[PDB]
Amino acid sequence: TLSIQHGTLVTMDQYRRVLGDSWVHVQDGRIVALGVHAESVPPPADRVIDARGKVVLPGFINAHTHVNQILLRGGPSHGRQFYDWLFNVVYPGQKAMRPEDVAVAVRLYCAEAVRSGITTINENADSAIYPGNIEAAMAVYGEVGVRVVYARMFFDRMDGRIQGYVDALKARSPQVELCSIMEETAVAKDRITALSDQYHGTAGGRISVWPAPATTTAVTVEGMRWAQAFARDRAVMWTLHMAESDHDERIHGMSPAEYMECYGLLDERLQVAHCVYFDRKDVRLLHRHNVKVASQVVSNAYLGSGVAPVPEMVERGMAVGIGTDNGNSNDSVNMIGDMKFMAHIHRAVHRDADVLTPEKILEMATIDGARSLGMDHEIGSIETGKRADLILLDLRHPQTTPHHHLAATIVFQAYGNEVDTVLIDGNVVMENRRLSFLPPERELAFLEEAQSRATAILQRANMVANPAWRSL
Amino acid sequence: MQTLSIQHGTLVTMDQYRRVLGDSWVHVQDGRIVALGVHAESVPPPADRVIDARGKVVLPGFINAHTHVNQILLRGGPSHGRQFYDWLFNVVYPGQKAMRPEDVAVAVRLYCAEAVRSGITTINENADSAIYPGNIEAAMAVYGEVGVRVVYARMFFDRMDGRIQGYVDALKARSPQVELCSIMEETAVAKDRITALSDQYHGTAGGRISVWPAPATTTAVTVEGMRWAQAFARDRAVMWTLHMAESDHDERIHGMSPAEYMECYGLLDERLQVAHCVYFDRKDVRLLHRHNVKVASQVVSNAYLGSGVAPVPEMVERGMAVGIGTDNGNSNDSVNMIGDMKFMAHIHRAVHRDADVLTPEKILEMATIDGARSLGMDHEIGSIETGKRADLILLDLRHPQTTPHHHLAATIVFQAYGNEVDTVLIDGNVVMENRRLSFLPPERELAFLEEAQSRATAILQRANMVANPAWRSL
Ligand SMILES: [Fe+3]
Ligand SMILES: [Fe+3]
Structure with missing residues (x-):
């Protein structure tokens, strides 16, 4: 099991929710739950990936x-x-x-x-x-x-x-x-x-x-x-x-x-x-x-x-x-x-x-x-029941600063090297750019x-x- | 409560499934379409008056x-x-x-x-x-x-x-x-x-x-x-x-x-x-x-x-x-x-x-x-559906220009001249009947x-x- 914590979640869900300081729980290749840190405690997990200061997107x-x-x-x-x-x-x-x-x-x-x-x-x-x-x-x-x-x-x-x-x-x-x-x-x-x-x-x-x-x-x-x-x-x-x-x-x-x-x-x-x-x-x-x-x-x-x-x-x-x-x-x-x-x-x-x-x-x-x-x-959104294909982007680089509207920043500013960590089917395929x-x-x-x-x-x-x- | 029944027409409903209902009826009560049905499967409710649409096409106005x-x-x-x-x-x-x-x-x-x-x-x-x-x-x-x-x-x-x-x-x-x-x-x-x-x-x-x-x-x-x-x-x-x-x-x-x-x-x-x-x-x-x-x-x-x-x-x-x-x-x-x-x-x-x-x-x-x-x-308005106002028109396609007719929309758009409307209801009232205003x-x-x-x-x-x-x- 894997818990991704303290990120901003850009869900691409039906309401296009963007959830600040929020978490995602992953089990058996799936997104099992999501929540907001101020309102809920994330389920226990075998490991926690710290996404503080980072943006979480569907892959x-x-x-x-x-x-x-x-x-x-x-x-x-x-x-x-x-x-x-x-x-x-x-x-x-x-x-x-x-x-x-x-x-x-x-x-x-x-x-x-x-x-x-x-x-x-x-x-x-x-x-x-x-x-x-x-x-x-x-x-x-x-x-x-x-x-x-x-x-x-x-x-x-x-x-x-x-x-x-x-x-x-x-x-x-x-x-x-x-x-x-x-x-x-x-x-x-x-x-x-x-x-x-x-x-x-x-x-x-x-x-x-x-x-x-x-x-x-x-x-x-x-x-x-x-x-x-x-x-x-x-x-x-x-x-x-x-x-x-x-x-x-x-x-x-x-x-x-x-x-x-x-x-x-x-x-x-x-x-x-x-x-x-x-x-x-x-x-x-x-x-x-x-x-x-x-x-x-x-x-x-x-x-x-x-x-x-x-x-x-x-x-x-x-x-x-x-x-x-x-x-x-x-x-x-x-x-x-x-x-x-x-x-x-x-x-x-x-x-x-x-x-x-x-x-x-x-x-x-x-x-x-x-x-x-x-x-x-x-696939394609951060929603309960879907596969855990998720990416963590760090916008704390010169090119992506400042950043307020996330889609604009990503589309118009990011170069393509800002992706830190990548999960596919719940498996960590890249972590801190290490493949x-x-x-x-x-x-x-x-x-x-x-x-x-x-x-x-x-x-x-x-x-x-x-x-x-x-x-x- | 005032009522009207239109009977034995072909109903071009323009409803959610675009149903076209042969030999079918519409029941109107106080300006509103209350019910519809097919004559072979259902009996129309009693009404103060029946308009016979046999051989005619019923559309929303x-x-x-x-x-x-x-x-x-x-x-x-x-x-x-x-x-x-x-x-x-x-x-x-x-x-x-x-x-x-x-x-x-x-x-x-x-x-x-x-x-x-x-x-x-x-x-x-x-x-x-x-x-x-x-x-x-x-x-x-x-x-x-x-x-x-x-x-x-x-x-x-x-x-x-x-x-x-x-x-x-x-x-x-x-x-x-x-x-x-x-x-x-x-x-x-x-x-x-x-x-x-x-x-x-x-x-x-x-x-x-x-x-x-x-x-x-x-x-x-x-x-x-x-x-x-x-x-x-x-x-x-x-x-x-x-x-x-x-x-x-x-x-x-x-x-x-x-x-x-x-x-x-x-x-x-x-x-x-x-x-x-x-x-x-x-x-x-x-x-x-x-x-x-x-x-x-x-x-x-x-x-x-x-x-x-x-x-x-x-x-x-x-x-x-x-x-x-x-x-x-x-x-x-x-x-x-x-x-x-x-x-x-x-x-x-x-x-x-x-x-x-x-x-x-x-x-x-x-x-x-x-x-x-x-x-x-x-x-x-705009369709023949239950709850809507009874704004309904009856067209007669038995004229040279609209013969033959199989697909009704094509017939109306490409053949009809505009004088084929016989009877018109608006809010359930008969405003025109057999072209008489x-x-x-x-x-x-x-x-x-x-x-x-x-x-x-x-x-x-x-x-x-x-x-x-x-x-x-x-
Ligand atoms: Fe190609
Ligand atoms: Fe004008």
Whole structure:
């Protein structure tokens, strides 16, 4: 049992209560009780965590990300439109990674993520097809203690239209191999079903498995319908990348949202990612079927895609979470940095300093994010009965001083290093910035290994790591 | 206790589950819907009279969310082809001023006749000529006798908008023989007059008549006047209403939108109903949404006067209470809800290039249950539900234009002309039956129309207004 005491609790509960000098009691992975110190004595606990002078929040929820690609950041990944990045960087880089590289990628990602207060990660696994990768990744997620949705991507249909464009893009890095990860529909089903049977609900309920048809052009109608029915039969969600680029825009003369509507493929268990190339009608169609959304505001900028209509969706009460997207289209895994970006980009583009409140941005990173993953009954707020995914932030630093309104301070001032202590499913995963799965005496050597492995991955893939200085 | 039973109709309830009940009945006791049922499962209670609706469709009465009644005598030639301010200064103000109380009584009856014939049972009358002696009394006597449910929103203007004067003179030169009028009043005088009007008429005619304060616009009324209206609505559990952003010259009250200006002073609240909202951006919609402001949309008039097209689909998708108003009797120029529904459906589809932008069901909701919500009256009217007032209309779809008919909302919105309403009940009283009006019987109808025609001709002569401009193709 664990008692967190004397903090300010930012509950994100139904009344958005903010409780000064208050406590939380945790038992068997759950929040069992809460109270105010002046009115009540906290129950006895095996241990007390002192949060005096600190702010307690629900853990941040990364609503859509791609983990293993983190080893491709730091030089190779920037300055390219989506498809250029995909074909010259992501596909070949992923392919050159071995299972032992994956294990290091995952631990590096989880170290950055937990340090920034992320406790749930929706991993869209585009490299699950390669032998050994699932097993390597899953062993590290389990050990680390993070809550993970492992959304297994598949592609079962050739999009032949885009080929002369692809060859031109490939000529930018001709020594880098063009890859294919297409699989037959029935093979994808069997592989995802077996993955779910083996890993879903493992690591004490912390790991889930979803089917992830990649896009409306890369997956057949049958494949998407299978994913849809699978989500329904197993009480999970299914997810798809929607309208991330201007070449996706026209699946057969209508938008991807329209196309899915025609086939009855929009439902309340679908979470779509991106939605940059969206019009009013598309928003209406998602709204009507209660589709969940993950917005990758930073990555949409990094890749030169654009700006999604998040304010419109939010004003319709839609469940919109925030994803950091790829470890190499951001290039950080920092929810607080992404929140600030979500606040500012929309203000700038609408010329409206009040287009999204910092409270609302904080909601997107917590309780609404949970809702976007279909997990809001279990996580995303500090409420009795929910899982004990909790973070303690210290605002006593120069950047976060002064602080009066907590959501404003967090969104507009915090850098992302203010998170001290992190609980996931009631287990202490970080304490005073010390990571339980990467102790301080191993941290530097681990980073050097990740650095070396990245350098080697890029050599095997024939990718340029450090292009010559260019001002224009 | 007086009772009425409507039997064997198809009931388009607009209730919480949007039930459509075939061969079903409604029981009315003292103006109120007491019970409903399906004939195959239940026997209707005994009643003082049975109305047979066999082969007919029963709806809640239509709600005209925002209109100006007396101006109806200015249609038929004098009113069209002019932008808002041109129309306002060369037609509406001088036409209204030339009307006597006896003209007002005729205008009101004519309006109510057209309205009831088209299935309208509640009318939100924005009274811009309430300042002239005798007009209130003449109008109220007719509204009371007619039996319609009426919100009498008493407009006032207490502040000069000096900025628009050289524009006005130019506009006035289009009809120089028509005189420029002023209806300004001192703040304290407007307050006393509206208070006395409310004390005298609010809740009269069996609860059918209500009184609201109506500051005209954010440029024609002081902050103090708007705040008084706001507090008055709160203290008396009514609404207040204002015209917002109807034109491109209203747009800038002091370097921000009217919605912004009102937000600055705390003048947006849940008892405010705003009319028009054409010159509105995403921020304005957000502000209204945030404070649960009600909206009346005058889609036909916004076209007629060359204002434009309001963002109704954006407001509706946010769950806002948007009703449909027909607006002025002379900026439409009909008082026909079914016609205006069809226009609401189509203008938005055309401008968005989206054939499914608003369903016909949603349009019908705007004319009924959402309209009631826009007036703050949805607890009392707008659907066929137990406890609500018996404002009910019977439509006959056995006409060429409404054949075939399967989906009723689509049939009503896209096919009906507006003459298919047969019978109208308001507060449980039969105001029209088989198209015969209780306050304008068939043997008087033609002579009454001739008197309205003469009076209109004479009003236009007294005002020096051109009734019938020479044929012009271009
Ligand atoms: Fe992505
Ligand atoms: Fe009006």
